Amino acid sequence: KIRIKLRGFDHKTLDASAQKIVEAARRSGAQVSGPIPLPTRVRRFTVIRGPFKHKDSREHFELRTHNRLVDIINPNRKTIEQLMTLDLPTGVEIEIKT
């Protein structure tokens, strides 16, 4: 039972490298709570296109933070093997507890 949370800006750099920390746990541990979605935290920036006046133009910019869960029931010491240090995501950050 290890709480897992995967955050990122890319919906593939997570959704994908979130199965590596599941398959590499399907055969070395429990069944895992699979990969759990979780709502996104979209931060918007609305700015004026032109550098001077013309305040009715704007153009929008969002920076959405996607989230993932997982959760490996049964703190399998045999799963900690495949995992530990074997992945490929560069634009990701992990937060995990027991």
Partner RNA sequence: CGUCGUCAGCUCGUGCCGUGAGGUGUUGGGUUAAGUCCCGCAACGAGCGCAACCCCCGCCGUUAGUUGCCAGCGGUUCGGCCGGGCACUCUAACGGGACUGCCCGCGAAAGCGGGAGGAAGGAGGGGACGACGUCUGGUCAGCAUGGCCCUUACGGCCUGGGCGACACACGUGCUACAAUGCCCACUACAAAGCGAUGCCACCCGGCAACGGGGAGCUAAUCGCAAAAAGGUGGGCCCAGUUCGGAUUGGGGUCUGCAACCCGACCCCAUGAAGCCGGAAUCGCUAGUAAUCGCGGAUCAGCCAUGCCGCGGUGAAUACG
Binding site for RNA (CB under 7 A): 3, 5, 11-12, 15, 31-46, 49-54, 56-60, 66-67, 69, 71, 95, 97
Q: Which of 74, 82, 78 is nearest to 98 (CA)?
A: 74
Residue of the chain from 48, 73, 86, 96 that contacts another protein (CB under 8 A):
48
Range 3-22, binding another protein (CB under 8 A): 7-10
Q: Name, in order, each residue with C-beta under 8 angstroms of 60's C-beta and a sequence gap of 6 or more.
A: 44, 45, 46
Residues of this chain that interact with another protein (CB under 8 A) are 7-10, 42-49, 51, 56-65, 90-93
